[PDB]
Amino acid sequence: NLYIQWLKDGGPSSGRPPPS
């Protein structure tokens, strides 16, 4: 879920690092 919520925002193109 966490990574899905990061990807839906645009992943790297959203000014935010990926969740570990």
Side-chain angles (χ1 to χ4, degrees):
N1 292 356
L2 53 107
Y3 211 93
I4 315 304
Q5 214 81 258
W6 179 79
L7 284 176
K8 76 99 176 244
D9 267 52
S13 299
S14 216
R16 59 185 88 270
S20 300

